[PDB]
């Protein structure tokens, strides 16, 4: 859910 | 047990089923009607 | 057995529905449109760069006065360009660096933003003080934000992580509606142009039309084999593109009640961030993880141009009030105007 929006943000895996 | 969804799901379904649909084709033709009676005012083309 | 019968008759609805499509499907969009000269050649060239941002940019809206657009950049930064003069108007300190979305209100007098906070933040940028500071923040949200609109002044619908949407009354901080339905987190949110509906997006690969006066799911539009990152309505309230990480763009018609084109290439597989229509809705801009943006020709589903001058990722794209101008966030910490 909230790594979607990390996905999003940058964010590496 | 669960049918709090499935209840949910068909009623949701039903309430989609019960619509009129315009025929692609007019709906085709409203979309290209719109685009080359607007043409004039995008500057990304006019 | 009282839940089979409900799995059974969901599926019969939805073969119906699928029947009711199919015997719409009468013509193709390439088949009506084939008679129309096509665009032959977009060449925009970047005209204007607003350097300033630190870090790489999340999200930017445009003002009406197709001038003035903010942006949220990952260095906790909100800023208000002049994209004429390339001049900075107001940098609001952001309280967050995982900032998602950002918007301006139609009156230019406030702006909001939202992300990892799950709160969507209001500035006044208008004070009669001539400093902005936070005139609200409509906590509420149980999910990230990942998109919010201003319909005006006063209230502004905010999709989130949560997978719902709220309208919310800025002034009294109150949510005065919540859009369920949706299995998937909400990625975009675009109003149809007369304020009264609104199609969404979610990871559930399906986008919705929503009435806002009684908060109810109209139509699903079904189609995408992923998450859909972008939602955007076209100008005339009738139909809508979409962009999801299945790398393909797609038009629906709303009164169809089905998709009308695919805009794909086997040499494009990377997935969509922002899509954006033109002032006639002819064109169909798109930003991809790549560092281009395609222009697509939205009626021929031809592939008419390229925004190539980023260095990293397109994060977010809008054209102007005017159809003047286009904008493009990227990665790269910077915005470039096209035309």
Known sequence: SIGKAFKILGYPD | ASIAQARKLVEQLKMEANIDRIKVSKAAADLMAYCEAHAKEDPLLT | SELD???????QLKNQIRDARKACADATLSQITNNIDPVGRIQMRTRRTLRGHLAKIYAMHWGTDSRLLVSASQDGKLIIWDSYTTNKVHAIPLRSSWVMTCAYAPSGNYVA??????????????????????????????????????????????????????????????????????????????????????????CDASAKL???????????????????????????????????????????????????????????????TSVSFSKSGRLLLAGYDDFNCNVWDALKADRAGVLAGHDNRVSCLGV?????????????????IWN
């Open chain 3, 320 to 336: 102007t009030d005017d159809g003047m101008a286009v904008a493009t966030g990227s990665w790269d910490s910077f915005l470039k």
């Open chain 3, 113 to 202: 933003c939202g992300g990892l906070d799950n709160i969507c933040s209001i500035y006044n940028l208008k004070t009669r003080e001539g400093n902005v500071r936070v005139s609200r923040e409509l906590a509420g949200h149980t999910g990230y934000l990942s998109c919010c609109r201003f319909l005006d002044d006063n209230q502004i619908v905010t999709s989130s992580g949560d997978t719902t949407c709220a309208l919310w009354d800025i002034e009294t901080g109150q949510q005065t509606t919540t859009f369920t339905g949706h299995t998937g987190d909400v990625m975009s949110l675009s109003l149809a142009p007369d304020t009264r509906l609104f199609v969404s997006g979610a």
């Open chain 3, 5 to 11: 019968q409900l799995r059974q008759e969901a599926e």
């Open chain 3, 210 to 272: 929503w009435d806002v006066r009684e908060g109810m799911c109209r139509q699903t539009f079904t189609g995408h084999e992923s998450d859909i990152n972008a939602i955007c309505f076209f100008p005339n309230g009738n139909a809508f593109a979409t962009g999801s990480d299945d790398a393909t763009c797609r038009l629906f018609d709303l009164r169809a009640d089905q998709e009308l084109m695919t805009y794909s290439h086997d040499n494009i597989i990377c997935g969509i």
